[PDB]
């Protein structure tokens, strides 16, 4: 009985940890996507600048 209780507690702890880790990794992926979006926006602005500089 003692061993079973220990195992059950370990399982609950690990499950909660996996839930937190999944949420955190999803949030960080969202943040990376946002920063990539900003980089792409300024890169397209610079590409337009280069297109005009082709006439420069």
């Amino acid at each position: 009985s003692d061993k079973l209780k220990e195992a059950e507690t370990r399982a609950e702890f690990a499950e909660r940890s996996v839930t937190k880790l999944e949420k955190s990794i999803d949030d960080l992926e969202d943040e990376l996507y946002a920063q990539k979006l900003k980089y792409k926006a300024i890169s397209e602005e610079l590409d337009h600048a280069l297109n005009d500089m082709t006439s420069i």
Partner: protein, 48 residues
């Protein structure tokens, strides 16, 4: 010719980083595919 070679390499690294950005976008897309598949399989596990 300096300006010519420089603008040439400029457009060149433009294209290179552009391909890299395309690859990274495809990476993000398959990443979201992975998010969705993990979500559905996790949800199935949790349902059971």
């Amino acid at each position: 010719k300096d300006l010519n070679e420089l603008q040439a390499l400029i457009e060149a690294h433009f294209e290179n980083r552009k391909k890299e950005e395309e690859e990274l976008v495809s990476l993000k897309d398959r990443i979201e595919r992975r998010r969705a598949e993990r979500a559905e399989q996790q949800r199935i596990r949790n349902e059971r």
